[PDB]
Design a protein around this motif. Sequence first.
Motif, PDB file in Angstrom:
ATOM      1  N   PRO A  35       0.789  -1.235   0.000  1.00 59.92           N
ATOM      2  CA  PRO A  35       0.000   0.000   0.000  1.00 59.92           C
ATOM      3  C   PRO A  35       0.819   1.281   0.000  1.00 59.92           C
ATOM      4  N   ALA A  36       0.366   2.266  -0.772  1.00 57.65           N
ATOM      5  CA  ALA A  36       1.037   3.560  -0.821  1.00 57.65           C
ATOM      6  C   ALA A  36       0.914   4.304   0.514  1.00 57.65           C
ATOM      7  N   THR A  37      -0.246   4.217   1.163  1.00 56.78           N
ATOM      8  CA  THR A  37      -0.485   4.976   2.393  1.00 56.78           C
ATOM      9  C   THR A  37      -0.028   4.196   3.621  1.00 56.78           C
ATOM     10  N   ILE A  38       0.822   4.814   4.437  1.00 59.40           N
ATOM     11  CA  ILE A  38       1.233   4.244   5.720  1.00 59.40           C
ATOM     12  C   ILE A  38       0.718   5.185   6.801  1.00 59.40           C
ATOM     13  N   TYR A  39      -0.137   4.668   7.676  1.00 54.83           N
ATOM     14  CA  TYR A  39      -0.684   5.456   8.779  1.00 54.83           C
ATOM     15  C   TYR A  39       0.315   5.480   9.926  1.00 54.83           C
ATOM     16  N   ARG A  40       1.298   6.361   9.777  1.00 55.95           N
ATOM     17  CA  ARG A  40       2.264   6.654  10.818  1.00 55.95           C
ATOM     18  C   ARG A  40       2.466   8.158  10.917  1.00 55.95           C
ATOM     19  N   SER A  41       2.816   8.628  12.112  1.00 61.25           N
ATOM     20  CA  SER A  41       3.094  10.049  12.319  1.00 61.25           C
ATOM     21  C   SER A  41       4.477  10.413  11.775  1.00 61.25           C
ATOM     22  N   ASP A  42       4.763  11.716  11.704  1.00 63.51           N
ATOM     23  CA  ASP A  42       6.107  12.178  11.284  1.00 63.51           C
ATOM     24  C   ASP A  42       7.210  11.964  12.342  1.00 63.51           C
ATOM     25  N   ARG A  43       6.857  11.368  13.479  1.00 63.59           N
ATOM     26  CA  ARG A  43       7.837  10.880  14.449  1.00 63.59           C
ATOM     27  C   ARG A  43       8.392   9.507  14.087  1.00 63.59           C
ATOM     28  N   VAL A  44       7.736   8.813  13.156  1.00 65.58           N
ATOM     29  CA  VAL A  44       8.129   7.468  12.744  1.00 65.58           C
ATOM     30  C   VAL A  44       8.680   7.572  11.328  1.00 65.58           C
ATOM     31  N   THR A  45      10.004   7.473  11.209  1.00 65.27           N
ATOM     32  CA  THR A  45      10.704   7.627   9.925  1.00 65.27           C
ATOM     33  C   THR A  45      11.595   6.424   9.649  1.00 65.27           C
ATOM     34  N   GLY A  46      12.069   6.340   8.412  1.00 67.12           N
ATOM     35  CA  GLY A  46      12.934   5.249   7.994  1.00 67.12           C
ATOM     36  C   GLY A  46      12.125   4.020   7.611  1.00 67.12           C
ATOM     37  N   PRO A  47      12.810   2.890   7.376  1.00 63.58           N
ATOM     38  CA  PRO A  47      12.131   1.640   7.021  1.00 63.58           C
ATOM     39  C   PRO A  47      11.032   1.284   8.024  1.00 63.58           C
ATOM     40  N   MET A  48       9.831   0.999   7.526  1.00 64.07           N
ATOM     41  CA  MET A  48       8.677   0.766   8.390  1.00 64.07           C
ATOM     42  C   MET A  48       8.615  -0.694   8.822  1.00 64.07           C
ATOM     43  N   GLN A  49       8.298  -0.906  10.094  1.00 69.43           N
ATOM     44  CA  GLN A  49       8.123  -2.255  10.617  1.00 69.43           C
ATOM     45  C   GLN A  49       6.884  -2.915   9.985  1.00 69.43           C
ATOM     46  N   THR A  50       6.969  -4.218   9.738  1.00 68.89           N
ATOM     47  CA  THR A  50       5.882  -4.990   9.135  1.00 68.89           C
ATOM     48  C   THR A  50       5.818  -6.326   9.852  1.00 68.89           C
ATOM     49  N   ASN A  51       4.887  -7.185   9.443  1.00 71.71           N
ATOM     50  CA  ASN A  51       4.799  -8.550   9.974  1.00 71.71           C
ATOM     51  C   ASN A  51       4.711  -8.542  11.506  1.00 71.71           C
ATOM     52  N   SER A  52       3.881  -7.646  12.031  1.00 79.49           N
ATOM     53  CA  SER A  52       3.733  -7.463  13.475  1.00 79.49           C
ATOM     54  C   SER A  52       2.336  -7.800  13.935  1.00 79.49           C
ATOM     55  N   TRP A  53       2.208  -8.028  15.238  1.00 78.64           N
ATOM     56  CA  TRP A  53       0.896  -8.266  15.849  1.00 78.64           C
ATOM     57  C   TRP A  53      -0.023  -7.031  15.698  1.00 78.64           C
ATOM     58  N   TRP A  54       0.584  -5.843  15.578  1.00 77.82           N
ATOM     59  CA  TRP A  54      -0.104  -4.556  15.571  1.00 77.82           C
ATOM     60  C   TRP A  54      -0.251  -3.906  14.192  1.00 77.82           C
ATOM     61  N   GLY A  55       0.181  -4.593  13.135  1.00 77.15           N
ATOM     62  CA  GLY A  55       0.328  -3.973  11.818  1.00 77.15           C
ATOM     63  C   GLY A  55      -0.905  -3.324  11.220  1.00 77.15           C
ATOM     64  N   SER A  56      -2.096  -3.804  11.575  1.00 76.89           N
ATOM     65  CA  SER A  56      -3.317  -3.232  10.990  1.00 76.89           C
ATOM     66  C   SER A  56      -3.509  -1.740  11.318  1.00 76.89           C
ATOM     67  N   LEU A  57      -2.918  -1.290  12.424  1.00 75.83           N
ATOM     68  CA  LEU A  57      -2.890   0.136  12.779  1.00 75.83           C
ATOM     69  C   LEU A  57      -2.155   0.983  11.730  1.00 75.83           C
ATOM     70  N   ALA A  58      -1.105   0.424  11.142  1.00 70.03           N
ATOM     71  CA  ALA A  58      -0.317   1.108  10.105  1.00 70.03           C
ATOM     72  C   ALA A  58      -0.947   1.097   8.713  1.00 70.03           C
ATOM     73  N   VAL A  59      -1.793   0.110   8.439  1.00 75.27           N
ATOM     74  CA  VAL A  59      -2.326  -0.128   7.098  1.00 75.27           C
ATOM     75  C   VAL A  59      -3.752   0.395   6.955  1.00 75.27           C
ATOM     76  N   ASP A  60      -4.604   0.086   7.925  1.00 73.45           N
ATOM     77  CA  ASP A  60      -5.979   0.589   7.945  1.00 73.45           C
ATOM     78  C   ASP A  60      -5.991   2.022   8.461  1.00 73.45           C
TER      79      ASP A  60
END
Length: 752
Positions: A35-60
């Motif tokens: 997905p083009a859109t990553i739901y993260r704030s501008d405090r979270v930069t660099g390579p994004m974490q994936t394959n996590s228990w919490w990942g739906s927060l970043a994608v949805d």
Amino acid sequence: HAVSVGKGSYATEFPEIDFGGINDPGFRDQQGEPPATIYRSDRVTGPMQTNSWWGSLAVDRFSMNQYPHPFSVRHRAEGLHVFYDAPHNMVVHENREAGTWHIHGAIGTDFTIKHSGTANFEQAVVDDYNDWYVRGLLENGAHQMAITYGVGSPYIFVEYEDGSAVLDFDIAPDVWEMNGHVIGFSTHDHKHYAAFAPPGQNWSGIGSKTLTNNADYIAIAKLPEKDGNMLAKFEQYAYSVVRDAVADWTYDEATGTVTTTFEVTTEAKVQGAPDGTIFALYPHQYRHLASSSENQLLQNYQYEIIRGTMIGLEGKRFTTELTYPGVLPSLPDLGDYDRERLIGYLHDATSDYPTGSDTYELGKYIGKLATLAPIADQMGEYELAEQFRGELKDILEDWLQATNASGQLKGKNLFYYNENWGTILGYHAAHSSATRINDHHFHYGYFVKAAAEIARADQEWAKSENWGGMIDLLIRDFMADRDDDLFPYLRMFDPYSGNSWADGLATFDAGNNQQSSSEAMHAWTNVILWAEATGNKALRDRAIYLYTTEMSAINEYFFDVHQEIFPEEYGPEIVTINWGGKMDHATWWNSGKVEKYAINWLPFHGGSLYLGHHPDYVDRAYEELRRDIGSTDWNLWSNLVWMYRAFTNPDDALQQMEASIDDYGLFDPGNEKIIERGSTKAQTYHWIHNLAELGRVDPTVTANHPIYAVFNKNGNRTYIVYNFSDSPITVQFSDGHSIQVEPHSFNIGNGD
Ligand SMILES: OC[C@H]1O[C@@H](O[C@@H]2[C@@H](O)[C@H](O[C@@H]3[C@@H](O)[C@H](O[C@@H]4[C@@H](O)[C@H](O)O[C@H](CO)[C@H]4O)O[C@H](CO)[C@H]3O)O[C@H](CO)[C@H]2O)[C@H](O)[C@@H](O)[C@@H]1O
Ligand SMILES: OC[C@H]1O[C@@H](O[C@@H]2[C@@H](O)[C@H](O)O[C@H](CO)[C@H]2O)[C@H](O)[C@@H](O)[C@@H]1O
Ligand SMILES: *[C@@H]1O[C@H](CO)[C@@H](O)[C@H](O)[C@H]1O
């Protein structure tokens, strides 16, 4: 448009895909990007974490349902819904015709954590994360609500901007302890919780559906019991908000001990709040708790979850201790096989070919060749072994180059770096490896296997300036160390849950999932072998940590070797797919009975001996599968069942093999009845006869080097070591036994 890495390269621009005339929309849609859109704030930069228990927060936009055990939670416009699966919420269902079983709870709401200023948040973003907690941020202009939570945290920490706290219930809760700023309460259906605000900020609305507090900070806790002494204990750490959390490990090569310390760093929300928390430990952790952590246990603080019983432990840190059991590049030449019959099977395997062009099907094929080559070496068929390794080189040298002869990007058989997320994607893709960032351990593990077998015979090829650079890049994608400029930390692995999560996005209401735990263990094995062959100690040790920790989770949650976790009413002796919130005896594709077991055994390789550590489990699982089949007429993948059976009864495995192995001839993609398509007759025949001579895996003996195995047949031990060094070595075993091993060889069973 590409970056050179030794003799290879990866694409930095999304290639023009060569679809090969295939119009099938499914296949075509797989050749895309995450997905083009990553739901993260501008405090979270660099390579994004994936394959996590919490990942739906970043994608949805908000999130899907998540399982920060002991809770389930989900983000919505109105706030954070909080739930706990009580026994009346849990069910075990069987679908006899499908051959499936399901252990699951409900997607309910005990209460919603809300913000006094708005119930129409615009989105929820990832605002920070660490090794296993996340900080989710619900946003509506000046109105913000930051929620810190995690697997193994019985707290949810809530921080408000431009408003104050609200807890909303559909049916009014029973507030059974009212201490002003701290409340103990129960849902209508008797689920026990607590809420904490700073001293002087008293809760209002007691007796109604809506509890309110003027504070800009609260914590929620799940209480083990309706117990005021427990409430008092939770009060001690309710103002210590987790900011950092790290799982640091050491591998003691002399003893085999893998030690992992889980440490939090908190920020005080009231004067004098301690630097620590209350952890909730999973079975794979507390069953291996270090002696030094035992005093921190809160003995009667238990929570029931999908994964059994969690227990409370207080303080800043705790430590677990595990035993790495060794791995091998292959089983050695120790079987009582007909050598000419095995040689025949080795030549038969030249008819095999990959059943697709994607990374997984190509992966299965190169794993097959890498498994055959050492057996060819053993049988004296050095020229055939060279054919197989030459075929591996041709395939890897193709895939590890992103550009064609002209210097333009290829349309298939290449790797591409997606910069948005920060991940290496392989085309052709399958199983949503590219579109969902799925299964990078499962797929790339087979590429590392091929590379490791090449490296065992040819150190030059594997040098960084040659083809090793690109292999190390693939490994970094799925298991990077900290501060990697291209990739997030240990992509696949959840250090606290103790297992890998296969889905990159986690956009499911059961959280994230993993099906083939054996393909994860295969990946970790191959990195150990690759790293040992190429002299990379730091990499090897990280893979040892992963192998050993994943093993501990597999034995609990996939196998339930201790017969403590699965409900008594659950019929099967394996869980096929583990989720954050549920367990299934079912597969991601339409399958029969054997596959719902054997997808957690395959492939068979030199790191598979972990499967035989618990012989009563191996017997119990085999017997249940046999009961359900009704005979030894396996519906599919017969050879995998025989190889598994050989862990405890090689005589039985042998008689089944002799009766059916030659039922069909050369490789046939349409028929996996006898030989599963990633396997061969040669592999099967070599494996079962080796186990017949060797006996049982012996996990009670360790060694002071990492590439070994110990077997035990009626009290007689066989010690196997492979030496990747140019120099001879001496290996000490924990039972007092000692051996010498010459360069680039096994100590015994090198063959011809
Ligand atoms: O082996 C038996 C059969 O297995 C079949 O594959 C199933 C697979 O279908 C199942 O997937 C579900 C997802 O469908 C589900 O998605 C939800 C969305 O549909 C919904 O609209 O939104 C929510 C998010 O808000 C989604 O969660 O999510 C659940 C988990 O939450 C998935 O389980 O997963 C099964 C394993 O659990 C898997 O076995 C297969 O296709 C058949 O061929 C086969 O007969
Ligand atoms: O090779 C064994 C079986 O693997 C199945 O795919 C699994 C997927 O469900 C999942 O995405 O992970 C990997 C693939 O990335 C596999 O374990 C195939 O669907 C089966 O054909 C195959 O027999
Ligand atoms: C898994 O394997 C079977 C054939 O063995 C195939 O029909 C499925 O589509 C694939 O996912």
